[PDB]
Structure 1
């Protein structure tokens, strides 16, 4: 951070999304005419929720980390009643939004996204940084439709022990993280497995009706496949969704897997 801004250095545009922490707007840096996103968070919420650190972690990590499949953080600043985050703007929304718009993905999008995601993680891991929050809602699409990871607030360094009171949903977390135990760079691989299954099926493999119900499904790795899911896909998903973190593939193994290579553009 060599420069410091102010809400006045921008021209806020249309609202992009989010709700309770604050909203995200399309922004235009007056000086340069640079387009970007401006996620505005209210101090009121921050404090009362005690996220001071996740925010610090987000602005922390995402500031340094620089990769084409990771969403950039350009800086931040806060006015009297809130904090602003200067973010890379991703022209094609979230992957979460695309999935609603398409229901399920073909083996090509699925394969591709997984690839871009692996490279980004492969890089994140380079720096012993585990995301631990890879869900389709934290995946944006670039001007060329490329995946771009965001939200490293829940992201920390590994190995780790943190038990952090709740995540809203357990869908993307692996047994270790739910079971409250120690975890590492492999948490991101179980998630990669979940995303893959979801992308092709339209629902995460452990979806349940109750938090409790899902924790059961997860903790026992109980998942089945629709008939349309091909064996190549099944193989890789079954390899990523291993109870034992140490039995999950390394990102290169994933990046070389036949089905991935046979369909990733």
Structure 2
């Protein structure tokens, strides 16, 4: 199920061939073109690598650690030259300079689902059908070919492009970048599974929880917890809480659900199986790959690119 079609292998050859030409990356070959976003640990720019004339996204993680330290992150990050899939954001390289690590990657012109959502109000189920397939394959790719678990699925980490492509970024490839960062730097745990917030055991089932959580959010047009009190719904389809108060909700209350009557039963069952609190019972990748919603969604020929440009003005 990880086979590429012809239009995918070609895009993959194209990318590599462009990459082949990029020598060693250095601060001075880059020129800011715009700011794509900021995070609780770094910034991201749409930049032009002058020599090659390549546009990229430059993530600058302004975290400070001795050249001794930062050289291990850069080491495990080199693994990204091995992550070639249609569902994974392309990587150009990583270097240190100015007390900040730079991770340069393929530029996704449609932005993150994060922003697609803000623009669109809510994403139609058939679209989320393709997003679901893409995440499932992205995580199946990373597990099968690199024994990696994503670790941070959320709408801001699923990126799309005018070619109708859906790819994942920000996955836990370097454990050292994880600790060297996930220390004096937090990044929202609001899409973390109950088991990871409880400290307990955690596999790719945790990533499945976050995907399910994200899909409900994208489907309804709002971060789903706590639940939209019935009258909140009539305004929605016709038909506050501090961080710590919320994470506690997740661990102690029943998982979110899609409002009924509005979405198909296959799609409700799909998210319900992702949102199962006990990891042992919640579906896994192999099961989700053959879920009715995924099989129906695949055979569907949805024009993701059309819908996208039409919605964000692309």
Q: 1:27 to 1:180 in 2, by over 3 A?
A: same
- 2:204 is the alignment partner of 1:185: yes
2:35 maps to what in 1?
15
Find the residue that maps to 2:159 and give its secondary structure.
strand
**2:114 corresponding residue in structure 1:** 96
Instruction: Tell me which residue corresponds to 2:77.
Output: 59
Aligned to 2:297: 263
Gaps of 5+ in 1: 157-163
Pick the aligned partner of 2:143 from 125, 143, 150.
125
CA distance in 1, matches of 2:71, 2:275: 30
Secondary structure at 2:190 match in 1: coil
Matched residue count: 255
Over 3 Å counting, the alpha-carbon distance change for 1:235 and 1:17 in structure 2 is same
Structure 2 gaps of 5+ residues are 1-19, 176-181, 227-239, 302-314
1:214 maps to: 246
Q: For each residue in 1:85-109, what CA deviation from the matched residue of structure 2 results, as whole angstroms up to 9, or x when unmatched? A: 2211111111100001111111111
Distance 1:59 1:111, change over 3 A: same
Deviations 1:209-249 (A, max 9, x none): 12233223322433243242332221111111112212222
SS at match of 2:111: coil
8 Å Cα contact 2:256/2:275 also seen in 1: no
Q: Find 2:221's aligned residue among 191, 197, 202.
A: 202
Instruction: Tell me which residue corresponds to 1:106.
Output: 124
Aligned residue runs from structure 1 range 157-196, under 5 A: 167-196=186-215
DSSP-derived class of the 2:94 partner: strand
Which residue of 1 is the match for residue 256 of structure 2? Answer: 223
Structure 1 residues 52 and 229 mapped into 2: Cα distance closer, same or farther (>3 Å)? farther
| 1:30 counterpart residue number | 50
> Which structure is higher in helix share?
2
Partner of 1:160: none
Find the partner of 2:166 among 147, 165, 168.
147
Secondary structure at 2:297's aligned position in 1?
Answer: coil
Alignment TM-score, normalising by the size of structure 1:
0.83
Distance of aligned partners of 1:172 and 1:52 in 2 relative to their CA distance in 1, 3 Å threshold? farther
What is the Cα deviation at residue 61 of structure 1?
4.6
Report if aligned partners of 1:130, 1:155 keep a CA contact under 8 Å in 2: no
Q: Hey, what's the Cα distance between the residues in 1 that align with 2:124 and 2:208?
A: 21
Q: TM-score by structure 2 length?
A: 0.71
Cα RMSD (Å): 3.0
CA change 1:7–1:230 in 2 (3 A) is same
Q: Conserved in 1, the CA contact under 8 Å of 2:81 and 2:92?
A: yes
Distance 2:204 2:104 in 1: 28
Could you list the per-position Cα deviations for residues 71-95 of structure 1 after superposition, in whole angstroms to 9, with x for gaps in the alignment?
1221122234433222111111111
